[PDB]
Amino acid sequence: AKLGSVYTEGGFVEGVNKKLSLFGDSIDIFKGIPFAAAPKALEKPERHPGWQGTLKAKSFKKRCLQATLTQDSTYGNEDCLYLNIWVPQGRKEVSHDLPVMIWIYGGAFLMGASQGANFLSNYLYDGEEIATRGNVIVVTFNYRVGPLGFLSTGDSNLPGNYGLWDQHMAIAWVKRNIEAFGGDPDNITLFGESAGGASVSLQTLSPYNKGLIKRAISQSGVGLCPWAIQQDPLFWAKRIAEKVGCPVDDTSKMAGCLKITDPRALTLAYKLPLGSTEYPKLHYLSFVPVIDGDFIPDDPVNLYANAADVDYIAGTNDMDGHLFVGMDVPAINSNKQDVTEEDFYKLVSGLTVTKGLRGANATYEVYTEPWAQDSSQETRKKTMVDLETDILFLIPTKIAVAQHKSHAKSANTYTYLFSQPSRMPIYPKWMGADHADDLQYVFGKPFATPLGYRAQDRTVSKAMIAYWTNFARTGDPNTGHSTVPANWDPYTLEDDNYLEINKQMDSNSMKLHLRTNYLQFWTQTYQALPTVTSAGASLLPPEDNSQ
Ligand SMILES: *[C@@H]1O[C@H](CO)[C@@H](O)[C@H](O)[C@H]1NC(C)=O
Structure with a gap:
């Protein structure tokens, strides 16, 4: 069948119907529907007022204003709050009451586009494969990224989290209109990777999404990740106002200035210092969400209550840290480059600054227990990857599933560990899954563009698409529209079981x-060590001018 012109809260919308077989099987594809009004620089989003007549949603609109790779603070413009929909159709009748999966893209909160872009190893986000292979409606949209989406003074002047408000607006529009297209409003599931995995988390914790989200899937990213929350917003808020001429040490004037400063100037002033220097950095992604007054009203760890009736899946790739540690210690397969013990201590120190050399010393100690030694420079390099995987993805993720499992009411909890080896020619033979290697499998690339894909890749992709969609349908990965290869057992603190x-x-x-x-x-242990919290009175309550 064909959906045709659908009437939504804003007006009529029309997309394209792509035929998929000689037996009626097609797929309606709408792209470019606005879920909010063009956002104002550093200002929260408003609902879109509507439009007269029909909207021809036939192509992705501009992605949000962001930087290219080197110069160009260009990739889109402020008018970028658009969503896209994929509705699998039969032949006899139109689809109705289908699960809905809203995808949230990653890109370290600085880059990103619904239009399958802004990412590395993998990037295209076409819901056709998932929609059709799982009989599920798939949605994608744009959310503000960069200074423009997460710049904050840490007070009423500039709260930040604008990017999270956008994600919320998308989820909201879907809640209110998805039935027009054949979706079941009470079966909305969110999924995402990296920063997107963290956003899903943060979106389930936010009081604003009280009864919108039914289930959730977080891949290589969660709200408790050291990188998801900016502890000291103003820090970089001033520095940005430093590059662009704005009254630095005067929050009010500073906020007023920024809000009126040129978007592209604001965008570009934030250049990731991925250069030739080893000072503790290369993971100082300053523009990330913050704990403001309302969207994220407290530390994420205390917001769990909000996700008690939300079925949750959270997982990790066995070497998620590989991608990042490499930027620090550039010894991937550099056989003619060796990692010394002090090299390891040096990385440890940098990673455990807030606990001094006591923390650095305890960590080095726990992490160096094995006897594979110098001779096994592989093991050394192996542990350096374990370290950053644990710190950046695994630990935060374990705590989140446990936390969710314990405070769960009716929700189910499942966790996983993706370990399909990365066959990237530039990595050492011991490589497991790196950050983002999961994307191609989840989105069904081995099927969409099989050229260059072994059958194993189609095996894995068939399984993951099956698990994600069954879950999106029943809350159970083992029951739904597809056949599961192996049983996925629900998490228990007792067993700490992972697929x-x-x-x-x-x-x-x-x-x-x-x-x-x-x-x-x-x-x-680590947590018990004294912190170099030492900031005098530069603590959350002291000297914040009553917000
Ligand atoms: C470990 O660090 C502590 C200070 O936190 C220091 O007293 C001790 O000498 C260090 N030991 C080694 C072996 O580096």
Whole structure:
């Protein structure tokens, strides 16, 4: 069948119907529907007022204003709040009451576009494969990124989180209109990776999404990740106002200035210092969400209450840290480059600055227990990847599933570990899954563009698409429109069970206790060490001028 012209809160919308077989199977595809009005620089989004007549939603609109790679603070403009929809259709009748999956893209909160772009190893986000292979409606949209989406003074002058408001507006529009297209409003599921994985998390915790989200999936990213929350907003708020001529040490005037400063200037003033220097950096992504007064009204760890009736999946790739540690210690497969013990200590120190050399010393100690030694420079390099994977993805993720499992009411909880080896020619033979390697499988690339894909890739992709969509349908990965390769057991604090996802999907894919001892170190021992919180009175309550 064909949807045709659908009437939504704003007016009529028309997309294209792509035929997929000689038997009626088609797929309606709408692109460019506005969920909000063109946002004003550093200002929250308003609902879109509507339009007269029909909207021809046939192509992705401008992605949000962001920087290219080197110069160009160009990639879109402020008018970018658009969403796209993919509705699988039969032949007999039109689809109705279908699960809805809203995708939130990553890109370190600084880059990103619904139009399958702004990402590295993988980037295209076409919902056709998922929609059609799982009989699910797939949605994608744009949310403000960069200074323009997350710049904040840390007070009423500039709260920040504008990018999170946009994501919320999308989710809201979908809640209110998705039935027009054949979706079931009470079966909205969110999924995302990296910053998108964290956004999904933060969106389930926000009181604003009280009863909008039914289920959620976070991939390589969660709200408790050290990188998801900016502890000291003003810090970079001043520095930005430094590059662009604005009254730095006067929040009010500074905020007024910025809000009127040129978007492209504001965008560009933020250049990631990925250069030739080893000072603690290369993971100082200043523009990320913050704890403001309302959207994220407290530390994410205390907001769990909001996600108690939300079915949740959270997972990690066995070497998520590889991509990042490489930027610090550029020894991937550099056989003619060796990592010394002090090299490891040096990385540790930088990673544990807030706890002094005591923290650095405890960490180095726990992490260097194994006897593979110098001779096994592989093991050394191996542990350096474990370290950043644990710190940036795994630990935060374990705490989030446990936390969710314990405070769950009716919600289900499932976690996973994706380990399909990266066959990137420029990485060492020991490589497992790196950050983002999951994307191609989740979005069904091995099927969409099979050229260059082994069958194993189609095996994995068939499984992941099956798990995600079954879950999006029943809250259970093992029950839905598709056949699951191996049973995925619901999480328990008792077993700490995780499905290892790869080509060998069988009864033995369900495993227990992934790096329990390190969870312990980071959460008990380490945490107990005195912090260099030492900031005098530069603490959250003192000297914030009553917000
Ligand atoms: C470890 O760090 C502590 C200070 O936190 C210091 O007293 C000790 O000498 C250090 N030991 C080594 C072996 O580096």
